[PDB]
């Protein structure tokens, strides 16, 4: 018999908590909107003990602040801000007349766990 399930950052269980859980019994987690479950969504009451719980991978937030800098702006839409899931790509072109000064590929990237590497475009 286990106690209440552990918490995880940016997520919670998909059911209402109880005080004591009979062994064999499981519960699932879910992450907040745009966060990505890493690991098994389910845990089990293993001899009076919870099995291991998942991680929630961070999305990447593309601000009007970040835009004004690396001198890149939004390629398709014209939203002054945008959110990207982990495992999902964003695409820019350069600012008011600049060249691609980063790597031989980098305009198209993979947000992963809050990390997204921006292409830099330098002036003139």
């Amino acid at each position: 018999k286990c106690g209440p399930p552990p918490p995880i950052d940016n997520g919670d269980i998909t059911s209402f908590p109880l005080s004591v859980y009979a062994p064999a019994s499981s519960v699932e987690y879910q992450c907040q909107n745009l966060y990505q479950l890493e690991g098994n969504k389910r845990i089990t009451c293993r001899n009076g003990q919870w099995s291991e719980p998942p991680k929630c991978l961070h999305p990447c937030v593309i601000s009007r602040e970040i835009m004004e800098n690396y001198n890149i702006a939004l390629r398709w839409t014209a939203k002054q801000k945008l959110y990207s899931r982990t495992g999902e790509s964003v695409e820019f072109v350069c600012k008011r007349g600049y060249r691609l000064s980063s790597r031989s590929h980098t305009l198209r990237t993979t947000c992963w766990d809050g990390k997204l590497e921006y292409p830099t475009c330098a002036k003139r």
């Binding site: 940016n10 919670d12 269980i13 209402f16 908590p17 907040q32 999305p59």
Partner: protein, 292 residues
């Protein structure tokens, strides 16, 4: 009677819940007619029970069974049900399920709450019906509702305190850019509640008032009543009893269609003013809100 009852029922619940609250909090039942309390409690029960038929499998609410649920309405339900927890039996799964849906489904990574299915009856949302600063205004509105539920649900819903914190960060990071008195008042209450209103933000909050007695913007005056009520709640959180008497007088002097928010917020703020403030001024009439 307009048709989308998931919303209309909340409009009709509102006068009764906030009247009872006001009279409980100020302990003025003796004067009003203590005989009438039991009846008011049953009217609240009947509002609550009727709202349950609009609760979706997701634990969110909407005007109809097959309309997408509203973020704003689901948060207004949480706030109203939270004021009623020691008035009637409110099932925690109903209240904390709605809280968890907000947190899990409608909050964006940077803390913002978003509305994907606006309410049909836009007159019920008071000064939110404005389109500038809606991210801040709505995030504040929802967070205030989360704050009301924190102690009922913190246990049933572990993600609640972090979602609270994350909403506060977003308000704090954008408070200084705000232009409208309404947002300054509503976000200022939300921040003050968490003790996170200070420095330039506190100064900005206080200096936004007109004549040190109201928070107002060009527009429907009902929105300024509602703004100033939040502001009065923020001042009570701050324990700033020096700033308070002119605010209370201006509000008391301002005694319909589209008045759900004004009514809710004036009665809340004035109840807390009398509950908290030493030698408070004599105050208005509750039988309008609570007839027989």
């Amino acid at each position: 009677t307009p048709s989308g009852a998931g919303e209309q029922n909340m409009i009709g619940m509102t006068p009764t819940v906030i009247a009872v609250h006001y009279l409980d909090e100020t302990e003025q039942w003796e004067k009003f007619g203590l005989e009438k309390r039991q009846g008011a409690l049953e009217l609240i029960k009947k509002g609550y029970t009727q709202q349950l038929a609009f609760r979706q499998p997701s634990s969110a609410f909407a005007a109809f069974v097959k309309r997408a649920p509203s973020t704003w309405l689901t948060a207004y339900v949480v706030k109203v049900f939270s004021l009623a927890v020691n008035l009637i039996a409110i099932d925690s799964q109903v209240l904390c399920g709605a809280v968890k849906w907000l947190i899990l489904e409608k909050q964006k990574p940077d803390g913002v709450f978003q509305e994907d299915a606006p309410v049909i009856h836009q007159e019920m949302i008071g000064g939110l019906r404005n389109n500038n600063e809606k991210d801040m205004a709505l995030t504040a509105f929802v967070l205030i509702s989360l704050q009301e539920a924190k102690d009922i649900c913190e246990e049933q819903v572990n993600s609640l305190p972090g979602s609270i914190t994350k909403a506060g960060d977003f308000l704090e990071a954008n408070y200084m850019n705000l232009q409208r008195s309404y947002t300054v008042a509503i976000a200022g209450y939300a921040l003050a509640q968490m003790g996170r209103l200070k420095g330039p933000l506190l100064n900005k909050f206080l200096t936004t008032a007109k004549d040190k007695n109201r928070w107002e913007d060009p527009g429907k005056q009902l929105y300024n009543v509602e703004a100033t009520s939040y502001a009065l709640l923020a001042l009570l959180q701050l324990k700033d009893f020096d700033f308070v008497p002119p605010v209370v007088r201006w509000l008391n002097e301002q005694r319909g269609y589209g008045s759900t928010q004004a009514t809710f917020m004036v009665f809340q703020a004035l109840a807390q003013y009398q509950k908290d403030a030493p030698d408070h001024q004599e105050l208005l009439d509750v039988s309008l809100q609570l007839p027989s």
